Design brief:
It is classed as immune system. Keywords: pre-BCR, b cell development, immune system. The protein is an all-alpha fold. Helices cover 38% and strands 0% of the residues.
Length: 24
């Protein structure tokens, strides 16, 4: 299935909302 675009925001978002590492 096309879970590479409609699902990319699934794990990716976690890097912007779940991964608040030391960076601005």
């Amino acid at each position: 299935s096309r879970s590479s675009l409609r699902s990319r925001w699934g794990r990716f978002l976690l890097q912007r909302g779940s991964w608040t590492g030391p960076r601005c």
